[PDB]
Amino acid sequence: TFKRRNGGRNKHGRGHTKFIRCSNCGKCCPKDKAIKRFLVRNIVEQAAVRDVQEACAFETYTLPKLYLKMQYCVSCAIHSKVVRVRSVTDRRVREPPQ
């Protein structure tokens, strides 16, 4: 039985797509199929923001940000709970969670 119209990937009008390496396990996975997330978070966690600001060596200074593009294979994504198993009707929803 076929359970996904797209076949679990995002290839249309295309022969082959080069793979990426899972950021967790390193498994090869087609890029159009890998679960991709973009994390933009302060380098200093909110707990240490106050201490770092107090220890700042300049009159004013904006703390930088860390940008990370995580590309997970299906197994790693499910295990780490980046994605979860959804109902038959719910898995057709493509909009991101609020």
Partner 1 sequence: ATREGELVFGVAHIFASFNDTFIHVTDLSGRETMVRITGGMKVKADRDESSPYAAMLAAQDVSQRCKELGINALHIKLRATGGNKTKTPGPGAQSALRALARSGMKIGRIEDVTPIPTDSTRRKGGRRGRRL
Partner 2 sequence: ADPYAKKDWYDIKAPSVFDIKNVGKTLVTRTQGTKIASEGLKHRVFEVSLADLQKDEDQSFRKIRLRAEDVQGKNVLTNFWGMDFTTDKLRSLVKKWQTLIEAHVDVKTTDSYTLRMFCIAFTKKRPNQQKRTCYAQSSQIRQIRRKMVEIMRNQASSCDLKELVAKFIPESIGREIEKATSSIFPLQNVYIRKVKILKAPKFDIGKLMEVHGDYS
Partner RNA sequence: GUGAAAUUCUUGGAUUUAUGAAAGACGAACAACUGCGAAAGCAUUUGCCAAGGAUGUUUUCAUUAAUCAAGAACGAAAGUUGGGGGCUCGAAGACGAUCAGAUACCGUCCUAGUCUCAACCAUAAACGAUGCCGACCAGGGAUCGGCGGAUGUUGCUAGGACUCCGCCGGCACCUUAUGAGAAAUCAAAGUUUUUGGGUUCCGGGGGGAGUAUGGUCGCAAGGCUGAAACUUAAAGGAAUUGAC
Partner RNA sequence: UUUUUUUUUUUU
Contact residues for partner 1, defined by CB under 8 A: 21-23, 25-28, 43-45, 47-48, 51-52, 54-58, 61, 63-64, 66, 68, 73, 76
Contact, 40 vs 66, CB < 8 A?
yes
Residues 16-35: x/- map of binding to RNA (CB under 7 A)?
xxx-----xx-----xx---
- φ, ψ for residue 78, nearest 5 deg: -65, -45
The distance of Cα 46 from the centroid of its chain, to the nearest Å, equals 21
The distance of Cα 21 from the centroid of its chain, to the nearest Å, equals 13
* Closer CB to Zn ion, 9 or 44, in the complex: 9
Residues lying near partner 2 in the complex (CB under 8 A) = 58, 60-62, 64-67
